[PDB]
């Protein structure tokens, strides 16, 4: 029961016959998930976590790269993946649903494998991921460091349908989200107007909302979405909302989180992304690895 590093393995609901690329790679590189798991539980116990220095993230990343690599050289839709600890090791599961992802957690558990986590590669918005119980959750290695990305966990999901391209969000549900977000942000930022602006520059995946459906790459315009200023009170202005998406050569998913970046009297944030290690950090903030 001492924190260490070791080579994890993955389990999948993979089906041999399914030619779906994930199932093809999964079956080969993965083993059946254990049906009857299997949690121990602790309380009054406190452990130091750190979603920002977590070897588990690196392992998942390497597998997904290799996943896409083998894949590309048609069926495509990600599967919930599980990551398990070798005999001699276990995985601490922090149960404090208020955890900022860094520091001490006074309420932890013990499992061998992680929950089903779909490897969905995207930018600006995390999709099909898990939700935050209760309040909006806010995470960053260093807020004082505007250069470090900010991960915002959603406690209520928003549906999305990009198809052809164009995508759609419910205005009513979006503005609801952002006010509560500027609120949480206002908690971390005092006498400062919290503005939201589209990605200021850089690669096309990073400046638009990017993601892949059925094997097609969708790069969608985000200018309308990140166009709101929120002082004490709050109000988002933009042209339901529609975002123009480009294609390459229909899918309905749930938005569950955000990636923000602050600019160095006001504090404006923009959408980030790129390093998919955050998409992972988004789902592996709760896990940690110890040898017994």
């Amino acid at each position, epitope marked *: 029961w001492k924190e260490a590093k070791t080579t994890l393995f993955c389990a999948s609901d993979a089906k041999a016959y399914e030619k779906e690329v994930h199932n093809v790679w999964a079956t080969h590189a993965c083993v059946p998930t254990d049906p009857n798991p299997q949690e121990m539980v602790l309380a009054n116990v406190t452990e130091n976590f750190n979603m920002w220095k977590n070897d588990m993230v690196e392992q998942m990343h390497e597998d997904i790269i290799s996943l*896409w690599d083998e894949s590309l050289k048609v069926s495509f839709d990600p599967i919930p993946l599980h990551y398990c600890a070798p005999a001699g090791f276990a995985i601490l599961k922090c149960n404090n649903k208020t955890f900022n992802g860094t520091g001490p957690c006074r309420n932890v558990s013990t499992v061998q494998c992680t929950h089903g986590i779909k490897p969905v590669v995207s930018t600006q918005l995390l999709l099909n991921g898990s939700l935050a119980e209760e309040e909006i959750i806010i995470r960053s290695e260093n807020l004082t460091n505007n250069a470090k990305t900010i991960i915002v966990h959603l406690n209520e999901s928003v549906n999305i349908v990009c198809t052809r391209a164009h995508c759609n969000i419910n205005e009513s549900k979006w503005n609801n989200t952002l006010q509560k977000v500027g609120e949480e942000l206002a908690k971390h930022f005092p006498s400062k107007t919290i503005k939201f602006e589209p990605s200021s520059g850089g*690669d096309l995946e990073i400046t638009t909302h*990017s*993601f892949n459906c059925r094997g097609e790459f969708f*790069y969608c315009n985000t200018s309308d979405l990140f166009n709101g200023t929120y002082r004490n009170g709050t109000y988002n202005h933009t042209g339901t909302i529609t975002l123009q998406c480009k294609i390459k050569q229909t899918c309905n998913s749930n938005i569950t989180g955000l990636l923000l970046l602050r600019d160095g009297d006001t504090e404006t944030f923009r959408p980030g992304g*790129g390093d998919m290690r955050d998409n992972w950090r988004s789902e592996l903030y709760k896990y940690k690895v110890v040898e017994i």
Partner: nanobody, 127 residues
């Protein structure tokens, strides 16, 4: 992920030339960018060159266009940096670096935000 190790750094008279080599111990997928950044003393980390791993498109920092040249060898999992007509300003630690861009729209390499790094190699230019 991929393991980066730069070499060939050194000390050279102004106007001189020098070649740096980065080698990835892991393996680079098709959707990768490989580039060079450098940090001069007292200053911050800037960009120098980038090459698409698959298509081999390049991009150079303006202060570099014409003098440096970035090349790859997929067989050896290696990227190289030929630096000619060196100036005292080119003095810095050079870092090989990489970036997994599976959602890249084009073969054009990036000039920003890399995710995987090397430990750096020393480059010093004497006036």
């Amino acid at each position: 992920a991929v393991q980066l190790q730069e070499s060939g750094g050194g000390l050279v008279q102004a106007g001189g030339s020098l070649r740096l080599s980065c080698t990835a111990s892991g393996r680079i997928s098709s959707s990768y960018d490989m580039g060079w950044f450098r940090q001069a003393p007292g200053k911050e980390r800037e960009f120098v060159a980038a090459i698409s791993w698959s298509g081999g498109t390049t991009d150079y920092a303006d202060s570099v266009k014409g003098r440096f040249a970035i090349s790859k060898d997929n067989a050896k999992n290696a990227v190289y940096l030929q630096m000619n007509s060196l100036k005292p300003e080119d003095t810095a630690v050079y870092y090989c670096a990489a970036k997994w861009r599976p959602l890249r729209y084009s073969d054009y390499p990036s000039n920003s935000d890399y995710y995987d790094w090397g430990q750096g190699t020393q480059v010093t230019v004497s006036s």
